[PDB]
Amino acid sequence: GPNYCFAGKTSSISDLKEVPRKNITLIRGLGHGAFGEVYEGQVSGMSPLQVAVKTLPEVCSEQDELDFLMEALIISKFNHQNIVRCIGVSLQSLPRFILLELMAGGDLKSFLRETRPRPSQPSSLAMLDLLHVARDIACGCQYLEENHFIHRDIAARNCLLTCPGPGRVAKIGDFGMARDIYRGCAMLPVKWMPPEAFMEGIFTSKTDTWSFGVLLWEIFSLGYMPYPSKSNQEVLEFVTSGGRMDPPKNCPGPVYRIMTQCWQHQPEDRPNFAIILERIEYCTQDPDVINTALPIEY
Ligand SMILES: CN1CCN(c2ccc(C(=O)Nc3n[nH]c4ccc(Cc5cc(F)cc(F)c5)cc34)c(NC3CCOCC3)c2)CC1
């Protein structure tokens, strides 16, 4: 049985909150992908608690088994409002379950794509909504940084929202990349990686800073793919040459500046998450920033 260490503390399968299987009802499928397989569920104490349920295939390898356990351990040890909570697990029944905080808004990438301003709904999103999401994720990233946990895959695809409408809170919802390393390839998130990451292969919280800058571009572009028209190798060469993305359409200069400082070639020239947060908050208070209209997609 493997042990997991976070914030100087060691835990194992024993420390996970096993919820009796009979207390868990699957309500509906939500979807599947690189994150695994997710359902809406209910937990009763006998008003039940609405949750998300990630499942482990019954037909699976033993590394698969150990992956699932590790994912459970990693999430259960995080304690932050901008990281999805783990309600508990159900590993003593088959198929195995991890019970997570339900995020009714789905993944951030799809939300931004779906909620683009249009002639029919020309004010579905405003700059302040984008800045609030950015702040939400920076806050989760600051927690990770101060706890010396390197995420390694900060991207819109790995972020979730509490709800579609006003008052949505964005949260880090996937830790698969971090789980894999705790245990180059075509699946590597190259377009989110700093130049030194392909090179001497050393990751720091400043490598997360780089990725956060790319996330920021994703947010302000309303969900576009980074480096449009470039392949992984092309991006890699472009980025290490000093090349950087243009601002997303209608991006205020102050917001773009946060991106460009996140993409400084030298790691020590890049802001930590406390500085990123300060800059986002300043942007949030500047009327010329927040009064800037997002583009209408025709
Ligand atoms: C109109 N939209 C239709 C889709 N709808 C939703 C709502 C919720 C989810 C979803 O799985 N939510 C999760 N809640 N908690 C999770 C924990 C964990 C996870 C896993 C996870 C984490 C992450 F960071 C990103 C993900 F995509 C999935 C999810 C939840 C959801 N999931 C989809 C995500 C895209 O792939 C298909 C399913 C969709 C939003 C409304």
Pair 27, 109 in one domain: no
Which atom of ligand 1 lies closest to the CA of 172? Answer: 24
Pair 271, 178 in one domain: yes
Residue 173 in contact with ligand 1 by CB distance below 6 A: yes
Can you say which residues are annotated as belonging to the binding site for ATP? 32, 54, 101-103, 174
Query: Which tokens belong to 26?
Result: 């699957």
**Resolution of this structure in Å:** 2.2
Pair 134, 227 in one domain: yes
CA of 289 to the centre of ligand 1 (A): 30
CA of 107 to the centre of ligand 1 (A): 5
Residue 38 in contact with ligand 1 by CB distance below 6 A: yes
Write the residue with the smallest CA distance to atom 37 of ligand 1: 31
For this PDB entry, the determination method is X-ray
Pair 98, 110 in one domain: no
Each residue of 243-261: b (16+ CB within 10 Å) or e? ebbebbeebbeebbebbeb
In SS3 terms, the chain reads as CCCEEECCEEECHHHCCECCHHHEEEEEEEEEECCEEEEEEEECCCCCEEEEEEECCCCCCHHHHHHHHHHHHHHHHCCCCCECCEEEEECCCCCCEEEEECCCCEEHHHHHHHCCCCCCCCCCCCHHHHHHHHHHHHHHHHHHHHCCCCCCCCCHHHEEECCCCCCCCEEECCCHHHHHHHCCCCCCCHHHCCHHHCCCCCCCHHHHHHHHHHHHHHHHCCCCCCCCCCCHHHHHHHHHCCCCCCCCCCCCHHHHHHHHHHCCCCHHHCCCHHHHHHHHHHHHHCHHHHCCCCCCCC
Beta bridge pairs of residue 83:
172
Pair 113, 239 in one domain: yes
Domain range for 235: 103-286
Pair 36, 148 in one domain: no
Pair 65, 205 in one domain: no
CA of 269 to the centre of ligand 1 (A): 35
CATH number for the domain that contains residue 158: 1.10.510.10
Pair 130, 231 in one domain: yes
